[PDB]
């Protein structure tokens, strides 16, 4: 027994198990009622209903609501997604023990401690029925999953079935006209209390408090105020089929039966929760849990988990496996039991399932097993790690215990455990808790064989024969010999491609992809560590690593190709389908698409007209196809996706061939875009380009740098005033040299008030007379020679090139 | 009502009543409801009826103050009009002869930037154009620049309306009270007029026209606001080293500090720095002014030197100040810091002199005695002084306080060849009463290297050789010293031979010589006995033996660099340590992609099903620290619909309540029981919520000793170095690769990183990456490298140890 | 606007009353007061604190704080002398001041807060002249 959850809530009079989602209703005795999420631990509501004990809680779940009855003497109604209270209604004149929908119409069922059970209409003015018998308290009323009958079990020593539809019970004789009640001995002595009777049930423990079914069973067990519980069928009102269990020390409050185990699990308000024995009907054991007394048991009837209410607050407790071992073939998923008995195949996105038949498990699994072609099913039973159980095989597609016992098909045979292996039709066995080999000759292998023993390892599960004491050990085919042992790290799970020759192993970052023996294929890419993913047999590997689907791969590309709503582990891929099932083991199925696929399949085989119309909106996401497309450093995937800004600016740089950058850059609406497009350029060889970028970012000090190198010289004095007024003294300044005759920097220089520098400038020229203008304006003093000359020719031939580097040629590839 | 979102039914009906405190009251409920931000529309119809026209201010003012913090929201009672119910007969409220009815309409009417209020606004200064107060005509000036914010930057707001439309600016400086909301884009004219009235100044008024317009060829004119620009004018007019003798700066500064001990603190410094501006060598450093303070004449009286001896510090004021002082005595005053840190020193060691200055804890006295012999090491004068010093430190004359006193002149004797020859005889005094192993040590090193200036030995280490008291460490250092120097010169019944002889047995040998030595079985496990005893090949002289190594001083020992030395004075440095300076199905496809720097989550959200699904929302959810900076906002999710929707992501947030996994993203469709389903897009790890944060080598140091990081883990892929792989994935799990931890050469140089984060997650993280790539013979396992990991309760430790393998995610739709 | 809101705060960890003059912080006027208030608006018993990037000037009376907060300042004297002249108001109102005191008197003080700081910019009030108003 594991604990899912335990909340101290205190002294819960009524429990109760939602039907349609995993939810326990509480109503305590301190007059609030609580419902939870046990499994996801969050409070869905809490209600302080009425100051005293509320002793009887529902779920009404027609529509999204539950319904609580309290000493209030009422039953209401009430709204878990609103926190509201939908509807009143009066129940009683005493304790609301118990409540229970209808599921006719919105009418309301409660039970009461003032010895009758009443169904009342909320929609119409109408009260329907009451429901009139007992002659001491009904405790309980219960549901069965049909809503035409429920039990009640009071204390008058009775339990009473009734109709709800009907007025009180409804029967009528066929051999007479007359009412069934008898209030005269006759074959059975009663008095007069009944309109009719359809079954009064036997409730003597000195009455019983309740009453509960298993969910795919008439039979029902009631716990009684005494110490024993009593096990009826209500089908029959048979007395001949009705046994004590005796373990309880004090008055039992319930008993109902375990949905997903065989064993009927009783609470009693002594200090011990008992656990029965449903093949036996006596205490096998007894717990203590001390949280004291149990006022109140629950039994899921959605078969998930259990839960029985205490003095201290409630459990919801755990009998359930976890990560459980599993195959596809083409539409059968085979998987090893868990809660809800056998389901899967179909839906997609839902947590509803359904039945297929394709149960590879079908009697207690001590092996599931797939043949290695996906013909037979081995499966291993009567439990045992001795030396001998019985081993059933089944047919792949649909699946019974025998197929027929006069065909070779569906045979079984002794063997402690078998388990399939290669060569794909074969199977090896433990039989003396050793390593035999079977054959059966010819098909795949169904009888025993005693030959062939080693003395390592130890019989268990499979697919290849595992087997462990301190790694997990394949084992050969017609060899008593290991065939190799793996040891990894693992997330509690063995992952088989579809075939069960080959193994998929789960490692630090993902999963690597195997064959026979440990080999290793592939690496999924993928940083964390996959809860499972399984391959199309190679190729096509699709896997779950949260709530999507996703492929990892298929022919280079790589597509998340549709969420589901829930969590989930792939069940394995068999066929386009992949196929899942999760831990509670509810399906989804989804077939591989030619969405992302077929437009990564046309890029990589260079089609981008192919690939236009692949583009859709179940795949189109932001780079995959509208900026992915911009990743070639010879453009190609860069021509085709462009629409963006900077993916235009850089398509261009890639080329090289900057005419485009600078639109791109402009759309981009920035300068630093321009300057560096224009360095590009600079390096295409061409400088009207350069200019016109420089020009805008502002940057006619660089320009007017470049431009004698250029070889200009008209465009070279343009820069030189549109940098004077910036006073950029290595750029309006450098022109001037640039050009044989220095009076540009004279009277920029001038206007910077450096008339020294402008006199030096000026005089070496020969231009003495601006020179002397300057030291006349402001300070003289032109005679001083510096450690440069101040009057020393300047001339310089400006570009003896007639075509300019502006005018730099140019084909362009 | 400090707060109560839902309590608007009572409201209305406590807004009318037919008692004008209900709907004082009522109206009051509201304003403090929506201030802090909740519910009001419903209202409004009710609120509005009563206090419409009338002069009774109360709820006038009431309505009046919700008409500026809601209006335009609100609209059951008010709708949309230029003449609004907000402003129609408050025309009347604007015109009654009662200032604050008028008044207060006016302030709020203009207040608004709202354009359904412009026209209503305007004439509204007319209210206010007649000055019953201050507040009125201050009123004015601020409405007529809040109406020309409002819209009417051009002829609706800027000349006059009978009085004011934008001259209440100009009208203030010449009024004989002031207020210039003119700041900004007003009139010239006004401008101008505050100038005029710096003079004639109306003062809380100044402050308005001085933000304005500030500078002043004055000294002042008057008032607090004049005298707080005047200050920041002063520093203009000499920024020069400083203000030095601070302003009037000085009346806010002392606020700065107000607790407590640092206000003094922070004033001893300034006023240290105000003395002098000395050479400014290695703590010497003082600026502001050379001569404001001078120092040190011989004809000033009562001197400058008084206040420079509160800076030479024991604790002489509170520990805050004290640490101020000790560097602030070294600033004013030294050589460097070695001169003033002598005497300092002198004040502080251990003596026989005062006993408010020695203490009997041994680590102190020692680490007092290495900071003054430290000053010698520096600085050469400081040698004379201290070796007097150090032999009244042993004068003190208890086992351990002669101990601490040998161990540091030992040093500097290394330090100091034959120049400390003098202190031997001083030294040996206090070597008789022992208890410790300490005085052993340091007397049995300066009675051996000096022998050759006394004779005594025999007699001074005989007692103690035969004398007990705890003699482990006492080994190692007698084994390199007894013998050295001079080859037989001494002699009291032992010459420097028998030191040789006694040297050896001490070391490890066995000799009957000073009465047999105390102990000889060497110190800490790796030192021994036989490089000495091998060693003295020339008995006790300087050549190549004990007196050379004795009269030598291991690598460079020079400053305060802490070569043989420690770096100030002791009580100073232990602050300065203390000091780190830390700096209904629903189908998604997914990838993130980045255009124009915008990172963004590109969903598809895909119903492949002929089921309807309309009702469809899309939400990107906020988990934790991981929040959507705009969910997918299209309304798809109908009936086989592809769709694009883009959820734009965030990493840095605050924690919400709901669930804390990869990345929740939601989409609503039909269906009443799970109308919102939880579905997934591609990874996002816990990882994110952790903080990056950094760390220095000394809060490395302090957090690897504050909490263990034994726990290590090798992790594969970390073949590379600090900066490629391994800083790029630490990067990704909020880290990053700081400082090193590393000790490199021909033998050694594992790249070693330290890390530190501050994890939202109630701990930090740190780390050390190791990288094992050899650099010897036999590397630990060849290139990989060992992750030594922490975080404060090693729950993140985890994190960095698996987040420095590998990490990458791709797909391509 | 310089002067973002005026506030009287209850460190209770909420704005009590507070002050948006034009519609901007209304929301956010309570958890700024809610968060920094509490710590003493993180002062040490200093009038100018500034944390999270506003400027907040206080008062402590109580276990409530009467706080200015600007993030933006034109003058040093003036923040303090609009935090004063309020603070010599608000006990006409609330009789020092007090979380349930302080909320019946939304009114009160609210309105003086548009009548003392007005677009932000910090005008004058006085017991005398706050009656025309509440008249």
């Given at each position: ?60 779940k027609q529509q999204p609501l539950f319904v609580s009855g309290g000493d209030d003497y009422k039953i209401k109604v009430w709204n878990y997604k609103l926190r509201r209270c939908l509807f009143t209604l009066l129940g009683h004149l005493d304790y609301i023990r118990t409540t229970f929908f209808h599921h006719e119409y919105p009418w309301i069922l409660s039970a009461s401690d003032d010895q009758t059970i009443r169904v009342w209409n909320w929609q119409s003015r109408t009260c329907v029925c009451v429901l009139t018998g007992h002659n001491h308290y009904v405790m309980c009323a219960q549901f069965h999953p049909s809503e035409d009958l429920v039990v009640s079990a009071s204390l008058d020593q009775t339990v009473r079935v009734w109709d709800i539809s009907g007025l009180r019970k409804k029967n009528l004789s066929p051999g007479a006209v007359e009412s069934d009640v008898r209030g005269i001995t006759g074959v059975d002595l009663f008095g007069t209390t009944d309109a009719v009777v359809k079954h009064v049930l036997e409730g003597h423990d ?608 | ?813 | ?135």
């Amino acid at each position: 027994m594991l604990t899912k959850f335990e909340t101290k809530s205190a002294r819960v009079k009524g429990l109760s198990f939602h039907p349609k989602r995993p939810w326990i209703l509480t109503s305590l005795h301190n007059g609030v009622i609580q419902l939870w999420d046990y499994r996801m631990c969050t409070l869905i509501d809490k209600f302080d209903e009425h100051d005293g004990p509320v002793r009887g809680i529902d779920f009404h779940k027609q529509q999204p609501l539950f319904v609580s009855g309290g000493d209030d003497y009422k039953i209401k109604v009430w709204n878990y997604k609103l926190r509201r209270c939908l509807f009143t209604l009066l129940g009683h004149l005493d304790y609301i023990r118990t409540t229970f929908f209808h599921h006719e119409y919105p009418w309301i069922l409660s039970a009461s401690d003032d010895q009758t059970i009443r169904v009342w209409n909320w929609q119409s003015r109408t009260c329907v029925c009451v429901l009139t018998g007992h002659n001491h308290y009904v405790m309980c009323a219960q549901f069965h999953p049909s809503e035409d009958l429920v039990v009640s079990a009071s204390l008058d020593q009775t339990v009473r079935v009734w109709d709800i539809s009907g007025l009180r019970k409804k029967n009528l004789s066929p051999g007479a006209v007359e009412s069934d009640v008898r209030g005269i001995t006759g074959v059975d002595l009663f008095g007069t209390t009944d309109a009719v009777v359809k079954h009064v049930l036997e409730g003597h423990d000195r009455g019983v408090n309740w009453a509960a079914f298993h969910p795919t069973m008439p039979l029902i067990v009631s716990g009684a105020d005494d110490r024993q519980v009593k096990i009826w069928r209500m089908n029959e009102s048979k007395a001949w089929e009705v046994d004590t269990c005796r373990g309880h020390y004090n008055n039992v409050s319930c008993a109902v039966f375990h949905p997903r185990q065989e064993l009927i699990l009783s609470n009693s308000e002594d200090k011990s929760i008992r656990v029965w024995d449903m093949s036996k009907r006596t205490g096998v054991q007894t717990f203590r849990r001390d949280h004291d007394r149990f006022w109140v048991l629950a039994a899921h009837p959605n078969l998930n988990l259990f839960a029985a209410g205490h003095d201290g607050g409630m459990i919801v407790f755990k009998l359930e496996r976890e990560r459980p071992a599993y195959a596809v073939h083409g539409n059968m998923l085979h998987y090893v039991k868990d809660r809800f008995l056998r389901q899967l195949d179909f839906n997609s996105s839902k947590d509803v399932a359904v039945m297929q038949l394709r149960s590879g498990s079908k009697f207690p699994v001590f092996n599931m097993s797939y043949n290695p072609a996906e013909n037979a099913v081995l499966l291993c039973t009567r439990a045992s790690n001795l030396e001998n159980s019985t081993y059933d095989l089944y047919t792949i597609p649909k699946d019974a215990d025998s197929q027929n016992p006069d065909a070779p098909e569906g045979k079984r045979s002794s063997g402690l455990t078998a388990v399939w292996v290669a060569r794909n039709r074969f199977a090896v066995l433990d039989r003396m808790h050793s390593l035999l080999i079977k054959n059966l000759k010819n098909e795949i292998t169904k009888k025993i064989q005693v030959p062939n023993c080693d003395e390592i390892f130890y019989a268990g599960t499979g697919n290849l024969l595992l087997r462990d004491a301190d790694s997990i050990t394949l084992f050969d085919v017609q060899q008593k010999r290991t065939l190799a042992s793996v040891k990894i790290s693992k997330v509690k799970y063995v992952i088989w491609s579809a075939d069960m020759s080959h193994v998929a192993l789960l490692a630090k970052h993902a999963i690597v992809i195997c064959n026979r023996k440990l080999d290793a294929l592939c690496n999924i890419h993928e940083n964390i560590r996959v809860k499972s993913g399984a391959w199309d047999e190679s190729g096509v590997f699709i896997y779950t690593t949260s709530n999507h689907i996703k492929y990892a791969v298929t022919t280079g590309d790589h597509g998340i190709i549709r969420t589901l709503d829930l969590p989930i582990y792939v069940t394995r891929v068999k066929g386009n389908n992949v196929y899942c099932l999760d831990r509670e083991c509810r399906p989804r199925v989804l077939t591989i698409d030619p969405t992302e696929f077929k437009f990564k399949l046309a890029l990589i085989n260079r089609k981008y007209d192919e690939v236009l119309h692949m583009v859709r909106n179940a795949k189109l996401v932001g780079q995959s196809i509208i900026a992915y497309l911009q990743k070639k450093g010879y453009p190609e995937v860069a021509l085709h996706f462009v629409k963006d800004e900077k993916t235009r600016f850089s398509l261009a740089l890639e080329c090289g061939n900057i005419e485009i950058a600078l639109e791109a850059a402009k759309a981009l609406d920035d300068k630093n875009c321009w300057e560096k497009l224009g360095e590009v350029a600079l390096l295409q060889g061409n400088h009207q380009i350069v200019e016109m970028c420089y020009q805008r970012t502002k940057n006619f000090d660089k320009l007017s740098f470049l431009y004698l190198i250029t070889g200009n010289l008209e465009k070279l004095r343009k820069m030189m005033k549109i940098a004077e007024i910036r006073k950029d003294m290595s750029g309006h300044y450098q022109n001037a040299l640039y050009l044989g005759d220095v009076s540009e920097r004279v009277r920029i220089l001038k206007n910077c008030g450096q008339k020294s520098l402008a006199y030096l400038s000026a005089a070496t020229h020969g231009l003495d007379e601006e020179a002397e203008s300057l030291k006349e304006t402001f300070d003289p003093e032109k005679e001083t020679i510096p450690d440069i000359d101040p009057n020393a020719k300047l001339l310089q031939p400006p570009a003896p090139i007639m075509p300019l580097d502006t005018n730099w040629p140019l084909l362009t590839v | 009502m400090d707060s109560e979102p839902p309590s608007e039914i009572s409201l209305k009906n406590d807004l009318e009543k037919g008692d004008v405190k209900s709907k004082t009251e009522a109206l009051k409920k509201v304003i403090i409801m929506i201030l802090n931000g909740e519910k009001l529309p419903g209202l409004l119809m009710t609120i509005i009826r009563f206090v419409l026209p009338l002069q009774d201010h109360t709820i006038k003012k009431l309505l009046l103050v919700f008409w500026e913090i809601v209006p335009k929201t609100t609209p059951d009672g008010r709708l949309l009009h230029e003449m609004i119910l907000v402003c129609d007969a408050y025309r009347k409220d604007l015109q009654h002869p009662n200032e604050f009815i008028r008044g207060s309409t006016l302030r709020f009417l203009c207040k608004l930037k709202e354009a359904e209020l412009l026209e209503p606004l305007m004439p509204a200064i007319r209210a206010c154009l007649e000055h019953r107060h201050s507040y009125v005509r201050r009123n004015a000036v601020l409405a007529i620049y809040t109406i020309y914010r409002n819209f009417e930057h051009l002829i609706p707001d800027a000349p006059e309306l009978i009085h004011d439309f934008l001259v209440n600016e100009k009208d203030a400086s010449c009024k004989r009270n002031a207020f210039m909301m003119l700041i900004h884009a007003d009139q010239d004219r006004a401008l101008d007029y505050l100038s005029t009235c710096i003079d004639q100044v109306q003062t809380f008024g100044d402050i308005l026209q001085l933000v304005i317009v500030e500078l002043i060829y004055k000294v002042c004119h008057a008032n607090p606001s004049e005298r707080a620009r005047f200050i920041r004018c002063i520093y203009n007019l000499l920024q020069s080293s400083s203000p030095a003798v601070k302003y009037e700066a000085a009346g806010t500064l002392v606020t700065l500090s107000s607790a407590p001990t640092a206000i003094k603190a922070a004033a001893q410094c300034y006023i240290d720095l105000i003395i002098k501006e000395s050479d400014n060598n290695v703590k010497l450093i003082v600026l502001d002014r050379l001569v404001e303070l001078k120092e040190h004449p011989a004809h000033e009286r009562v001197l400058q030197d008084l206040v420079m001896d509160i800076l030479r510090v024991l604790s002489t004021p509170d520990l805050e100040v004290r640490k101020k002082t000790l560097q602030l005595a070294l600033d004013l005053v030294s050589s460097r810091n070695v001169e003033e840190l002598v005497i300092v020193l002198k004040k502080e060691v251990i003596k026989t002199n005062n006993v408010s200055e020695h203490e009997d804890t041994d680590k102190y006295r020692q680490l007092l005695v290495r900071t003054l012999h430290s000053c010698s090491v520096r600085f050469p004068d400081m040698a004379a002084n201290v070796i007097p010093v150090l032999m009244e430190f042993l004068s003190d004359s208890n086992e351990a306080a002669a101990a601490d006193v040998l161990e540091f002149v030992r040093e500097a004797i290394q330090r100091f060849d034959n120049l400390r020859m003098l202190i031997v005889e001083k030294m040996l005094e206090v070597f008789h009463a022992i208890k410790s192993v300490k005085i052993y040590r340091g007397a049995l090193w300066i009675l051996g290297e000096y022998c050759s200036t006394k004779e005594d030995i025999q007699s001074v280490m005989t007692e103690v050789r035969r004398s007990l008291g705890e003699i482990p460490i006492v080994e190692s250092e007698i084994k390199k010293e007894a013998g050295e120097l001079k080859p037989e010169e001494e002699i009291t019944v032992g010459p420097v031979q028998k030191l040789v002889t006694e040297m050896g047995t001490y070391a490890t040998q066995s000799a009957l010589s000073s009465s047999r030595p105390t102990k000889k079985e060497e110190d800490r496990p790796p030192l021994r006995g036989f490089l000495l005893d091998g060693d003295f090949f020339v008995a006790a002289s300087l050549a190549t033996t004990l007196t050379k190594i004795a009269l030598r001083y291991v690598a460079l020992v020079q400053e305060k660099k802490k070569q043989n030395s420690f770096v100030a004075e002791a009580m100073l440095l232990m602050a300065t340590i203390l000091h780190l300076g830390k700096s209904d199905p629903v189908y998604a496809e997914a990838y993130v992609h980045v255009n124009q720097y915008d990172i963004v989550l590109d969903v598809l959200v895909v119903n492949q099903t002929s089921d309807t699904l309309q009702n469809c929302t899309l939400e990107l959810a906020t988990l934790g620290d991981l929040k959507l900076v705009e969910k997918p906002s299209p309304l798809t999710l109908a009936p086989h619909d592809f769709a694009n929707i883009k959820a734009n992501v965030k990493v840095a947030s605050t924690e919400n309540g709901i669930i804390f996994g990869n990345i929740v993203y939601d989409v609503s469709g039909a269906a009443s029981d799970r109308n919102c389903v939880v579905l997934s897009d591609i990874h996002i790890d816990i990882m994110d919520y952790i903080q990056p944060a950094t760390c220095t080598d000394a809060e490395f140091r302090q957090m690897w000793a504050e909490f263990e990081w034994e726990n290590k883990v090798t992790v594969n892929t970390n073949m590379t170095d600090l900066n490629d792989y391994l800083q790029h994935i630490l990067k990704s799990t909020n880290m990053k690769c700081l400082t090193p931890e590393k000790a490199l050469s021909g033998y050694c140089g594992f790249m070693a990183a330290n890390l530190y984060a501050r994890s939202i997650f109630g701990e930090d993280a740190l780390a050390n990456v190791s990288i094992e790539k050899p650099v010897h013979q036999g590397p630990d396992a060849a290139v990989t490298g060992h992750i030594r990991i922490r975080a404060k309760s090693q729950g993140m430790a985890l994190s960095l140890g698996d987040k420095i393998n590998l990490s990458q995610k791709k797909t391509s739709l | 606007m310089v002067l973002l809101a005026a506030a009287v705060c209850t460190k209770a960890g909420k704005a009590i009353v507070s002050r948006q003059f034009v519609e901007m912080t209304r929301t956010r006027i309570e958890g700024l007061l809610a968060a920094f208030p509490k710590l003493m608006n993180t002062g040490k018993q200093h009038t100018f604190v500034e944390t999270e990037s506003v400027r907040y000037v206080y008062q402590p009376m109580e276990k409530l704080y009467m706080v200015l907060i600007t993030t933006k300042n034109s003058n040093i004297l003036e923040d303090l002398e609009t935090l004063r002249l309020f603070s010599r108001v608000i006990p006409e109102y609330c009789r020092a001041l007090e979380e349930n005191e302080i909320s019946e008197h939304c009114f009160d003080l609210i309105f003086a807060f548009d009548e003392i700081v007005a677009l932000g910019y910090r005008e004058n009030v006085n017991l005398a002249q706050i009656r025309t108003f509440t008249e």
